[model samples]
Target: ALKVGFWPAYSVSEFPPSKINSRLFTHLYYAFAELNAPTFEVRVPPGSEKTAEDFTPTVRRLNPSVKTLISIGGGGSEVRDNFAKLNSDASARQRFVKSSIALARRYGFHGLDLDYQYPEPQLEMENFVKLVSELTAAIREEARTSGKPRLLLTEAVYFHQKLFPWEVVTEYPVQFIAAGLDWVNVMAYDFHGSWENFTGAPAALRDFTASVGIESFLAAGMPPEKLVLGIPLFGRSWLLKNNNEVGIGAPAVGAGPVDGALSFSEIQNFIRGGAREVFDTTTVSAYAYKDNVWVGYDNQQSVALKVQYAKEKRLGGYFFWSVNQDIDAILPKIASDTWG
Candidate 1:
C-alpha cells in the first residue's frame, strides 16, 4: 500500500524534513516546486532551497525505501491558469514535461505529482487528458535513455469526477486518466468548508461525501487499486450564531477563528483547553465546541476508521494532506497500525 504524506516548503522552519516520521509513510512529497507561468519550467520558490535540496536525503536517513516526489503547482489561480496554458500547447507541455523531469532528477526524487485542482475552462478536461498522456510517454522515453526507473506520475484530483459549470464536458476523462496515471490522490477531505451557511464535516466519512466521491471514481472506470483516498490533518471550524444550537448544519455566521483552519495539534490544544470533543460514530468524524466556536475534525479513532474503510475497499493506499500538523506523527502511526 502507498501510504503518503505531504511536507510543504514554507513550513520547514517549524516542521523541517528532519522532523518527519519517514518510516510511517512509503512516499514523502515535497509539497510544491512551482512552474514558471510563462516558461512552464519548474522552479522551487526562492528561499526554500535549504530544505528542498535536503528533503530526499533527510527523509532517507531513516527509511531508504521511502520514495520522494516533488509536487508542482497548487490550487491557486496563477499556477492553475499557467498549467492550463501549458496544456493547451504541445510545445509548452513539452517544456513542462522536460523541466519537471530534470528537476526530479536533480533533486533525487523518485516521482512527480501535480497539485492543480478544479480545471475551470470548459476544455480543461481535454487538455488534462492530453497533458497526462504526453507526460506518461515522456517519462517512459526518459527511463530508457537515463537507465533509471521511470518516475511515478500522479495527480491530486478533486473528489468528484463530474464538476459543475462546464457546458460541454462536465466529467473527467477516466479512460485517459487510468491510462496515464499510476494512481490518483483524491482530495476527499475538502468536501465542505464555510461555503454554506450550514456546517458539515468536510472530511466526514462514508455517509457524508467521501464515499460518494470514491464511488464516482470507480463508477467512472477507475480501478480500485489506482485510487488513493486523501485525508486532511486539519479541521473546519465555524462561528455559530448560537451555542444553544450545536450539531452539523448549525447556523454558522463565518469562519470560527484563525482563518477557520485548525491543524491536528491545534485540535488537541482545543480539546485540552476545555473544548468539548465529540466523536460521531454515525459519520465517523469528531467535532469540538467551546460555546459558539465549533470545529469538525479527526482524531485517532476517526482516522482509524477511515484507514480501515480504505483497506476494505482495497484502494491503492491512504495519504495525508500533510505530516506537520499531527502530534508526534500520531495520526500517521494510527493509520499504519490500522492498515496493518
Candidate 2:
C-alpha cells in the first residue's frame, strides 16, 4: 500500500491536532520532541507533551487506521548538536535508544522518527548508523517482551547529493542505514529560498539547479518502497530589490516576512491581491511576483504533477512538510492523486 504521511509542527500556533484532516494520511508525525543534552533522554517541551498525549487518541478515534509517531531532534542547532553528542559514545547511545522507545510506548505512539537535521560528514555518519542499529534492536526487544508489534523506526534524510552525498562511496553507508530504517522521508523541498540571491521554487519537481530529486535517491540505491518524497505546504519568499526584475534568478534583497517564508494560505492571499502566478514547465513549479515581492511555492496543479511523478517512479509515497500551511483543500488533492 502507498503510505501517505503528514508532518505537523506541534509548536505551530495554527496547527492543533483537531484542525488536521486525520483521514487523509496513513501516518502523521507530531513534529519535534527535544533531546536532553546530557542525559540523552527524549523531552517533550512543556505544553507539547500534553498536546501529543491529547492528539494521538483523537487521531485514532477519527481514523482508526492512521498511525502516529513522535518526531525527534528537529528543534534547532542545539538539538542537532545534542544528537551528535548523544550518538558519540556507547553509554549515551544506549541511553538514547532506551529513553526514546520508552517515551513512545508511554505516550501511545506507534513509532519514533529521528529528525536530526543531519549528521556531520564521516564521524557523525558512523555514529548515526550505530544509533539506528541500537535503537532498532532495543525496540524489537521491547516488543518481544511485551508481545506487541515492534515500534516503527524511521528518519528524515536529505535527498540532494550536495547535502548528503549518500551515493558517494566514502559517505553515507546506505545499506547499513537502510537496514535499520523502515523508510526514509526524503526532504525534496527547500530547493531554493531567501538564502539565495535569486528567485526559485521552494520545491521544484525537476531540478533547474543542481539538486537531488526522486531519481537521485533511486540511483543512490534507495529502494523504491522505502523512499517517501517530501512535499512542501509552504512557499519561500523574498523581498525584491527591483519590482521590474521579477523572475527566476532575479535579484532579491532578503527573505520575506514571518521568518523568511509564508504559508500556502498566505500565498493565496498574495495571488488574490494581484500577484501574477507563473508556472515553469521545465521545473514543474509555480511562482508569483507582485510589486516588489517574489514568492516561489507549490499550488494544487504543481502538487498534482508531483504526485503523478511519484507514482510513475513507483516511489514509496509522498509526505508533506506540514499540514497547517495547506489551503484550498490541497491535502485532499494529494490524496486523490496518490490513491485515485
Candidate 3:
C-alpha cells in the first residue's frame, strides 16, 4: 500500500488549544483514522522553542494511527538563515543535533525532517553534507548505545528544471545526500505559478519525470524507495481584473498572491455559496468562480491523479502540502484511494 499524509502548518495558532481536544481533532482525525494511514507530518517551526513541550502531549493523547513528526523549515527565509547559522558553527551544529535528538526522545517523535530550503554558496556545501552526515551518525550511535532508534531523517528539496545554483542542488550531490537521508520530498508543486515569467500548467507527475525524473538522484545511485513526491493542496490566484481579462490569468498585481492565498476550504465555501468549479485541462487543475472573483486550486480529482502517479512510479509515498487547506474528509479519500 502507498503511504498517504498531510503537512500541517506549525505556525497556525488560530485554533485554540482548548478546542484542540478529542472532539475537534477527531473530526479530521477520523479521516486518517478511517483510511488507516500510518503517519501524518506536523511541521514545527524552528524558533518555536516550546514545540517539543506543546506537541508531545497532544500527539500522545491522540495516539493517532498516524506517526507524527515535527517537520522543520521550508518556504521561509528565517528557517534557512537559522539552518545556515547552526551548520556554520561547529559547536552549534553539535548542540543543535543533540537537542534535536533529545526533543525527539521527549516527544516520542518518529524522526527528523530537513526542510532547509537549500544552503547558501559552495562554501556551505561541505558543511551541509557534514551536518547531515553527522546527524545520521549521531542518531545511530545514540540509538545503539542508548537503546533508542533515534529517528528517521528526511529532506524537502526544490524541484525545477535546473537545480538552484546556490542551494542544496549545488552543495550536495543528489547521490550523496540521498545516501544520508531516508527520503527526499520533492516540491513538485509551484512548478508554475502567476509569478513565473510566463503562464504554465500545474506541475504534473509525468512532466516531473520527463523534466528531471527520479533519475536525477537515482542515476546518482539513490533508490526509488527513498523518493516521495510533494503535492500542493492550495492554489494561486492571479489578478486578471487589473489586467482586464475574464479568466484566471496573470495577477494584475504583477505577482502571484501570497499569505492571503485561499485554500480548498475557502474555495469550497465560495462554491457552496454559489460559485462554479472550473478546470484548466492544460494545467489539470480546478478553480471556482462567481462573477468576476475567481480562485484557482486543486480538488479531490486532481489530487487523485497525482497520487496515482506515485503508485505508477512505485515511489515511496505521497505527501500533501498541507492539512488545514482541505476539508477533514479529504484525508480518508486520499488514504483509501492511494494506500488502500
Candidate 4:
C-alpha cells in the first residue's frame, strides 16, 4: 500500500510543548482523521523542551491507526547546524539517538525520520553512516529487550544530481543506507525555484525518474521496496522588478504575493472558485492556470499518476512533504487508489 504522510511545521517558541493541544494543532489531527491517511509526521526540533511529553497525548488520542514519527532536522540554517553537530560530536549524536528512542516510547511514535539536508564531502558521508549505524543499533537493542515491534526508521534525501556532495551521493554505497533504515524518502520537489538557473519545477517526474527518484536509489543498490517518493503540494514564487527575470535560488514564498507560486490552500480556493483547472504534461505532473497567479502544484491527477507509477515500480509508497498544503479530498483519493 502507498503510505501517505505529512510534516506539520512545529516552531520552538510559538508551538511550545504546552500549546500542542491548541485548536490549530488538533485541527490537522482531525483533518488527517477525515483523510484517513495511515501515517503522520510531527516535527521534533532539537532544542524544543516539549520533546516526548508534548507528543504523547496526541498519539494516545489518535491511537492504533495513525502512526506518528519524530522528524529530525527541518529546512534552512537550523537543519545545517543540526547535521553539523550530528556528524562531528559523538555526544551530540548519542543525545539525538537517545531522544529518538525516548520520544518513541513516551509519545508512541512509530519510528524516526532523519532529514539531514546536504551533507558535505566524503568525510560527512562516513559520519552520516556512523550516525545511522549507532541509531539503528540502539533501536535494535531496545526492540530486543522490550519485545515491541521495531520502530520504523527512515531518512529524507535531496532529489538532485548537483545538490548533494559527490562523495556521499556518488561514492557512498546506497546499500548501506538501505540496510540502515526501513525506507528513504526521496525529496523530488524543489527542482525549480527562484534559486535555480531557470524557472519551473526542475524535479518533474521525468527529471526525477532520470536523476534521483526510485531509479536513483535502485541504481545505488537500495531495494525498490524501501524507497518512498516525496511530492510537493506547494509551488515556488519569485519576485520580478526589472524587465530581466530573476534567476533560480531567490527567496520564494508559497502562494503569496509572487506571481508564479500558490499554496495548497490557495489552490483549493482557486479550484472551488472556478478559477483553476488541472493540467497534465508529458514530462511532468502539475496543474496550471491561464491567468498564472501561481502554479497549481501536484494535483489529484498527477498524484494519481504517481500512485500508478509506484504500483508499477513496486515501491514502498508515496509520501507528501506536507498535508496542510493539499486539498483534504486528495488523501481519500490516495487511500482509494493506492491503499485500497
- The lDDT, on a scale of 0 to 1, for candidate 3 is 0.56
- The best candidate by lDDT is 1
Candidate 2: tens digits of C-alpha lDDT, residues 1-340 = 4444565654357666776777777788887777877887776776667777876887777789889888888746888889888888899888888888988988898999999777766778778888888898898899999999999888887765334454443344556657787887878888789889888877887753213456666676877778777877788899998999988889999997657788888888889989999987778788888998888887877887877777777877778777777745465556555556
**What are the runs in model 2 whose C-alpha is more than 4 Å off?**
1-12, 161-170, 208-211
TM-scores across all candidates? 0.96, 0.93, 0.77, 0.75
Best candidate, TM-score-wise?
1
lDDT of 4 by residue, 1-340 (tens): 5464554644224432333322222111211111001111222433543544445455345433445666666566655665765567686677767666765676556677776675656667678788889999999988998999888777777764334534434343577777788877777776565553334544467633423455666776677887776767676544333223323222233332354556656666766776445454664555444332335267666666666777677777767656545545453345345544
* Cα lDDT listed for each candidate: 0.85, 0.77, 0.56, 0.56
What is the total number of backbone clashes in candidate 1? 0
Q: Cα RMSD to native, each candidate?
A: 1.6, 2.3, 7.0, 7.5
Clashes of each: 0, 0, 2, 10
Off by over 4 Å in 3: 1-64, 160-162, 165-172, 196-202, 206-215, 242-260
Worst 10 residues of 3 by lDDT: 29-38
* Residue pairs whose backbone atoms clash in candidate 1: none
Cα misplacement distance, residue 157 of candidate 1 (Å):
0.9
Ranking by TM-score: 1, 2, 3, 4
